Write a protein that binds this ligand. Sequence first.
Ligand SMILES: COc1ccc(-n2nc(C(N)=O)c3c2C(=O)N(c2ccc(N4CCCCC4=O)cc2)CC3)cc1
Length: 126
Amino acid sequence: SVKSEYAEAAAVGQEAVAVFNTMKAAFQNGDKEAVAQYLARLASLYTRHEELLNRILEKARREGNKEAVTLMNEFTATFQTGKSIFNAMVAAFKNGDDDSFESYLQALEKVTAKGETLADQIAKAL
Ligand SMILES: COc1ccc(-n2nc(C(N)=O)c3c2C(=O)N(c2ccc(N4CCCCC4=O)cc2)CC3)cc1
């Protein structure tokens, strides 16, 4: 169903949030090897989430669930804002620009919060 597909995508998103927190702690602790590994993990999780979201979006659209589609489109906008920030943060990491990296972390926390509430709203609209 839309609900079961939603729960699959939710578990991928929940992993992405948890991995981000572990990555951030590694950065603060100076473990750059770990930061690099977790950035690569996040890149793959974001790709997977995008793939899952698009399939759910089209099913909800065919089902005439206009509210869920509207909320999914809002979530995509926040998620893609975060993805673009993430890509710039990966560049800052490999360039050793730690002040840029810190600024991006702050921006990603704000985007993540917007996506967390939208994710809750999507579940209610199903
Ligand atoms: C079909 O559409 C969705 C959308 C979202 C969910 N979904 N459900 C839950 C939940 N029910 O717990 C969660 C999510 C999710 O995706 N979450 C998330 C992942 C990633 C970001 N980030 C990280 C940094 C880059 C930007 C960005 O947006 C933000 C939020 C929060 C947890 C299911 C289905």
